Enzyme design. Structure first.
Site, PDB file in Angstrom:
ATOM      1  N   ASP A 126      28.394  38.158  44.367  1.00  0.00           N
ATOM      2  CA  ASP A 126      27.886  39.534  44.322  1.00  0.00           C
ATOM      3  C   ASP A 126      29.018  40.528  44.496  1.00  0.00           C
ATOM      4  OD1 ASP A 126      25.245  41.035  44.100  1.00  0.00           O
ATOM      5  OD2 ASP A 126      25.912  41.994  45.941  1.00  0.00           O
ATOM      6  N   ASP A 150      33.588  34.432  44.866  1.00  0.00           N
ATOM      7  CA  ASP A 150      32.340  35.011  45.310  1.00  0.00           C
ATOM      8  C   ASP A 150      31.528  35.471  44.099  1.00  0.00           C
ATOM      9  OD1 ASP A 150      30.568  36.376  47.255  1.00  0.00           O
ATOM     10  OD2 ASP A 150      31.353  38.235  46.315  1.00  0.00           O
TER      11      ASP A 150
HETATM   12 MG   LIG Z   1      30.650  39.845  47.283  1.00  0.00          MG
END
Ligand SMILES: [Mg+2]
Length: 282
Positions: A45, A43
Protein backbone atom coordinates in the site's frame (compact mmCIF):
# COMPACT_ATOMS: atom_id res chain seq x y z
CA UNK A 1 2.06 6.17 -21.97
CA UNK A 2 3.57 3.32 -23.97
CA UNK A 3 5.51 0.76 -21.96
CA UNK A 4 8.75 2.09 -23.45
CA UNK A 5 7.98 5.47 -21.76
CA UNK A 6 7.67 3.90 -18.30
CA UNK A 7 11.36 4.33 -17.49
CA UNK A 8 13.41 7.18 -16.02
CA UNK A 9 16.98 7.67 -14.86
CA UNK A 10 18.09 8.86 -11.41
CA UNK A 11 18.07 12.51 -12.70
CA UNK A 12 14.28 12.71 -12.41
CA UNK A 13 13.10 15.74 -10.38
CA UNK A 14 11.47 13.53 -7.72
CA UNK A 15 14.72 11.75 -6.82
CA UNK A 16 16.68 12.39 -3.59
CA UNK A 17 19.98 10.64 -2.71
CA UNK A 18 22.18 11.32 0.33
CA UNK A 19 25.08 9.25 -1.09
CA UNK A 20 24.77 9.17 -4.91
CA UNK A 21 28.20 7.60 -5.22
CA UNK A 22 27.24 4.73 -2.89
CA UNK A 23 24.03 4.20 -4.89
CA UNK A 24 26.10 3.80 -8.06
CA UNK A 25 28.30 1.22 -6.30
CA UNK A 26 25.27 -0.73 -5.09
CA UNK A 27 23.61 -0.64 -8.51
CA UNK A 28 26.85 -1.81 -10.08
CA UNK A 29 27.08 -4.76 -7.69
CA UNK A 30 23.45 -5.74 -8.46
CA UNK A 31 24.09 -5.57 -12.22
CA UNK A 32 27.33 -7.50 -12.08
CA UNK A 33 25.74 -9.88 -9.63
CA UNK A 34 23.15 -11.01 -12.24
CA UNK A 35 19.41 -11.55 -12.57
CA UNK A 36 19.86 -15.07 -11.16
CA UNK A 37 20.89 -13.63 -7.77
CA UNK A 38 18.19 -10.95 -7.52
CA UNK A 39 14.93 -10.77 -5.62
CA UNK A 40 12.62 -7.81 -5.05
CA UNK A 41 10.99 -7.31 -1.63
CA UNK A 42 8.24 -4.69 -1.72
CA UNK A 43 5.53 -3.25 0.45
CA UNK A 44 2.13 -2.91 -1.22
CA UNK A 45 0.00 0.00 0.00
CA UNK A 46 1.33 3.39 -1.13
CA UNK A 47 4.46 1.69 -2.56
CA UNK A 48 3.08 -0.39 -5.46
CA UNK A 49 -0.37 1.14 -5.03
CA UNK A 50 -0.73 4.77 -5.86
CA UNK A 51 -1.05 7.64 -3.33
CA UNK A 52 -2.41 10.30 -5.70
CA UNK A 53 -3.53 10.57 -9.32
CA UNK A 54 -2.65 13.95 -10.86
CA UNK A 55 -2.58 15.27 -7.33
CA UNK A 56 -5.95 13.82 -6.23
CA UNK A 57 -5.70 11.38 -3.33
CA UNK A 58 -6.37 7.81 -4.22
CA UNK A 59 -8.18 5.55 -1.73
CA UNK A 60 -6.02 3.25 0.34
CA UNK A 61 -6.14 -0.44 -0.45
CA UNK A 62 -6.21 -0.99 3.32
CA UNK A 63 -9.66 0.55 3.53
CA UNK A 64 -11.29 -1.20 0.55
CA UNK A 65 -13.03 -3.91 2.56
CA UNK A 66 -13.92 -1.67 5.51
CA UNK A 67 -15.41 0.97 3.20
CA UNK A 68 -17.46 -1.53 1.19
CA UNK A 69 -21.07 -2.68 1.30
CA UNK A 70 -20.08 -6.21 2.42
CA UNK A 71 -19.56 -5.26 6.06
CA UNK A 72 -22.34 -3.94 8.26
CA UNK A 73 -22.46 -0.61 10.09
CA UNK A 74 -22.16 -2.57 13.33
CA UNK A 75 -18.95 -4.17 12.09
CA UNK A 76 -17.54 -0.84 10.90
CA UNK A 77 -18.24 0.72 14.32
CA UNK A 78 -16.44 -2.17 16.03
CA UNK A 79 -13.40 -1.90 13.71
CA UNK A 80 -13.24 1.83 14.54
CA UNK A 81 -13.42 1.04 18.25
CA UNK A 82 -10.51 -1.39 17.86
CA UNK A 83 -8.51 1.28 16.02
CA UNK A 84 -9.12 3.83 18.76
CA UNK A 85 -8.00 1.30 21.40
CA UNK A 86 -4.93 -0.18 19.72
CA UNK A 87 -3.51 2.62 17.57
CA UNK A 88 -2.13 4.53 20.62
CA UNK A 89 -0.30 1.33 21.57
CA UNK A 90 1.10 0.89 18.06
CA UNK A 91 2.60 4.40 18.05
CA UNK A 92 3.67 4.60 21.72
CA UNK A 93 7.29 5.83 21.94
CA UNK A 94 7.59 4.40 25.48
CA UNK A 95 7.08 0.75 24.43
CA UNK A 96 9.59 -1.43 22.60
CA UNK A 97 8.65 -3.35 19.45
CA UNK A 98 8.71 -6.58 21.44
CA UNK A 99 6.34 -4.97 23.92
CA UNK A 100 3.93 -3.98 21.13
CA UNK A 101 3.86 -7.43 19.49
CA UNK A 102 1.17 -9.12 21.63
CA UNK A 103 -1.12 -6.12 21.29
CA UNK A 104 -0.73 -5.93 17.54
CA UNK A 105 -1.42 -9.66 17.31
CA UNK A 106 -4.53 -9.08 19.41
CA UNK A 107 -5.72 -6.11 17.30
CA UNK A 108 -5.26 -7.89 13.98
CA UNK A 109 -6.83 -11.08 15.27
CA UNK A 110 -9.87 -9.26 16.65
CA UNK A 111 -10.34 -7.36 13.40
CA UNK A 112 -10.08 -10.56 11.35
CA UNK A 113 -12.47 -12.30 13.73
CA UNK A 114 -15.04 -9.51 13.19
CA UNK A 115 -14.81 -10.01 9.44
CA UNK A 116 -15.52 -13.72 9.97
CA UNK A 117 -18.84 -12.81 11.66
CA UNK A 118 -20.07 -11.15 8.47
CA UNK A 119 -21.49 -13.09 5.61
CA UNK A 120 -18.62 -12.58 3.18
CA UNK A 121 -18.36 -14.81 0.14
CA UNK A 122 -15.23 -15.21 -1.94
CA UNK A 123 -16.70 -13.76 -5.14
CA UNK A 124 -17.44 -10.50 -3.30
CA UNK A 125 -13.75 -9.71 -2.90
CA UNK A 126 -13.40 -9.18 -6.63
CA UNK A 127 -16.58 -7.10 -6.62
CA UNK A 128 -15.47 -4.74 -3.88
CA UNK A 129 -12.10 -4.28 -5.60
CA UNK A 130 -13.78 -3.63 -8.93
CA UNK A 131 -15.91 -0.90 -7.38
CA UNK A 132 -12.97 0.71 -5.51
CA UNK A 133 -10.98 3.56 -7.03
CA UNK A 134 -7.68 2.07 -5.83
CA UNK A 135 -4.90 2.33 -8.41
CA UNK A 136 -1.40 1.01 -8.98
CA UNK A 137 1.46 3.43 -9.53
CA UNK A 138 2.02 4.61 -13.08
CA UNK A 139 4.47 2.31 -14.82
CA UNK A 140 3.24 -0.84 -13.05
CA UNK A 141 3.00 -2.67 -16.40
CA UNK A 142 6.70 -2.35 -17.07
CA UNK A 143 7.51 -3.12 -13.43
CA UNK A 144 5.60 -6.37 -13.21
CA UNK A 145 6.32 -7.43 -16.80
CA UNK A 146 10.10 -6.89 -16.41
CA UNK A 147 10.33 -8.96 -13.23
CA UNK A 148 8.15 -11.73 -14.73
CA UNK A 149 10.07 -11.88 -18.03
CA UNK A 150 13.40 -12.06 -16.19
CA UNK A 151 12.18 -14.67 -13.65
CA UNK A 152 12.87 -12.38 -10.67
CA UNK A 153 10.89 -13.37 -7.55
CA UNK A 154 8.76 -10.47 -6.25
CA UNK A 155 7.69 -10.79 -2.61
CA UNK A 156 4.89 -8.36 -1.81
CA UNK A 157 4.35 -7.80 1.91
CA UNK A 158 1.18 -6.36 3.38
CA UNK A 159 -0.39 -6.28 6.83
CA UNK A 160 -3.75 -5.92 5.04
CA UNK A 161 -5.93 -8.57 3.43
CA UNK A 162 -4.07 -10.72 0.89
CA UNK A 163 -7.20 -11.41 -1.18
CA UNK A 164 -7.73 -7.67 -1.73
CA UNK A 165 -4.14 -7.08 -2.85
CA UNK A 166 -4.23 -10.10 -5.09
CA UNK A 167 -7.47 -8.93 -6.72
CA UNK A 168 -6.04 -5.48 -7.46
CA UNK A 169 -3.06 -6.97 -9.29
CA UNK A 170 -5.28 -9.59 -11.04
CA UNK A 171 -7.72 -6.98 -12.29
CA UNK A 172 -4.82 -4.96 -13.68
CA UNK A 173 -3.72 -8.07 -15.61
CA UNK A 174 -0.27 -8.20 -13.97
CA UNK A 175 -0.74 -11.09 -11.50
CA UNK A 176 2.26 -12.99 -12.91
CA UNK A 177 3.50 -16.21 -11.27
CA UNK A 178 6.79 -14.72 -10.08
CA UNK A 179 4.75 -12.78 -7.50
CA UNK A 180 4.58 -14.17 -3.98
CA UNK A 181 2.21 -12.31 -1.67
CA UNK A 182 3.02 -12.38 2.08
CA UNK A 183 -0.16 -11.15 3.74
CA UNK A 184 -3.32 -12.20 5.60
CA UNK A 185 -5.31 -14.54 3.37
CA UNK A 186 -8.91 -15.46 3.94
CA UNK A 187 -10.06 -19.06 4.24
CA UNK A 188 -13.32 -19.97 2.49
CA UNK A 189 -15.48 -23.02 2.96
CA UNK A 190 -16.60 -25.13 0.04
CA UNK A 191 -19.71 -22.97 -0.45
CA UNK A 192 -17.45 -19.92 -0.72
CA UNK A 193 -18.24 -18.36 2.66
CA UNK A 194 -15.47 -16.77 4.75
CA UNK A 195 -14.74 -19.09 7.66
CA UNK A 196 -11.35 -17.94 8.97
CA UNK A 197 -7.85 -16.73 8.05
CA UNK A 198 -4.90 -18.86 6.86
CA UNK A 199 -1.28 -19.15 7.76
CA UNK A 200 0.93 -16.54 9.33
CA UNK A 201 -0.59 -13.44 10.72
CA UNK A 202 1.10 -10.34 9.24
CA UNK A 203 0.79 -7.12 11.27
CA UNK A 204 2.70 -3.84 11.22
CA UNK A 205 5.58 -5.09 13.38
CA UNK A 206 6.34 -8.51 11.77
CA UNK A 207 6.16 -7.61 8.09
CA UNK A 208 9.43 -9.25 7.13
CA UNK A 209 10.97 -12.24 5.43
CA UNK A 210 10.81 -14.56 8.42
CA UNK A 211 7.17 -14.91 7.29
CA UNK A 212 7.81 -16.23 3.76
CA UNK A 213 20.76 -18.02 -3.81
CA UNK A 214 18.80 -14.77 -4.11
CA UNK A 215 21.44 -12.90 -2.14
CA UNK A 216 20.94 -9.53 -3.87
CA UNK A 217 17.85 -7.55 -2.89
CA UNK A 218 15.99 -4.48 -4.08
CA UNK A 219 13.69 -3.34 -1.28
CA UNK A 220 10.80 -0.93 -2.05
CA UNK A 221 8.82 0.78 0.70
CA UNK A 222 7.09 3.96 1.75
CA UNK A 223 7.45 3.91 5.55
CA UNK A 224 10.41 3.84 7.92
CA UNK A 225 9.15 0.48 9.16
CA UNK A 226 9.47 -0.99 5.66
CA UNK A 227 13.27 -0.83 5.97
CA UNK A 228 13.08 -4.17 7.90
CA UNK A 229 11.23 -6.21 5.26
CA UNK A 230 14.37 -8.09 4.16
CA UNK A 231 15.24 -9.00 7.74
CA UNK A 232 15.36 -12.77 7.83
CA UNK A 233 16.70 -13.26 4.29
CA UNK A 234 19.81 -15.45 4.80
CA UNK A 235 23.14 -14.40 3.34
CA UNK A 236 22.23 -11.08 1.71
CA UNK A 237 25.35 -9.66 0.06
CA UNK A 238 23.96 -6.49 -1.58
CA UNK A 239 20.80 -4.53 -0.92
CA UNK A 240 19.39 -1.34 -2.46
CA UNK A 241 16.61 0.35 -0.46
CA UNK A 242 14.20 2.63 -2.33
CA UNK A 243 11.63 4.64 -0.38
CA UNK A 244 8.59 6.58 -1.59
CA UNK A 245 8.08 9.77 0.43
CA UNK A 246 4.42 10.56 -0.26
CA UNK A 247 3.46 12.99 2.50
CA UNK A 248 4.57 14.58 5.78
CA UNK A 249 7.57 15.43 3.68
CA UNK A 250 9.18 18.14 5.82
CA UNK A 251 8.86 16.01 8.96
CA UNK A 252 10.26 12.89 7.25
CA UNK A 253 12.68 13.88 4.48
CA UNK A 254 15.97 13.86 6.42
CA UNK A 255 15.26 10.56 8.17
CA UNK A 256 14.15 8.94 4.89
CA UNK A 257 17.30 10.14 3.14
CA UNK A 258 19.50 8.78 5.96
CA UNK A 259 17.84 5.36 5.85
CA UNK A 260 16.87 4.72 2.21
CA UNK A 261 19.50 4.81 -0.51
CA UNK A 262 17.05 6.46 -2.94
CA UNK A 263 14.01 8.53 -1.90
CA UNK A 264 11.26 9.29 -4.43
CA UNK A 265 9.38 12.38 -3.21
CA UNK A 266 5.78 12.85 -4.41
CA UNK A 267 6.28 10.55 -7.38
CA UNK A 268 3.14 8.83 -8.69
CA UNK A 269 5.25 6.41 -10.79
CA UNK A 270 7.55 3.40 -10.81
CA UNK A 271 9.63 4.96 -13.56
CA UNK A 272 12.85 5.25 -11.55
CA UNK A 273 12.55 1.69 -10.28
CA UNK A 274 11.85 0.44 -13.80
CA UNK A 275 14.90 2.30 -15.11
CA UNK A 276 17.08 0.67 -12.48
CA UNK A 277 15.65 -2.77 -13.23
CA UNK A 278 16.33 -2.38 -16.95
CA UNK A 279 19.86 -1.22 -16.27
CA UNK A 280 20.51 -3.99 -13.72
CA UNK A 281 18.94 -6.79 -15.80
CA UNK A 282 20.67 -5.64 -19.01
MG1 LIG B 1 2.96 1.13 2.55
Amino acid sequence: RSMAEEVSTLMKATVLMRQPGRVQEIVGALRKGGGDRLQVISDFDMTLSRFAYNGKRCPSSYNILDNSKIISEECRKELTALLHHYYPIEIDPHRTVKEKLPHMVEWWTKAHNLLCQQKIQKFQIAQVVRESNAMLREGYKTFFNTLYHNNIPLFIFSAGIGDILEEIIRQMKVFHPNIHIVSNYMDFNEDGFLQGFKGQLIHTYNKNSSACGKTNVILLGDSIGDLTMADGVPGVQNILKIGFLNDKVEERRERYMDSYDIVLEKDETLDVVNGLLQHILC
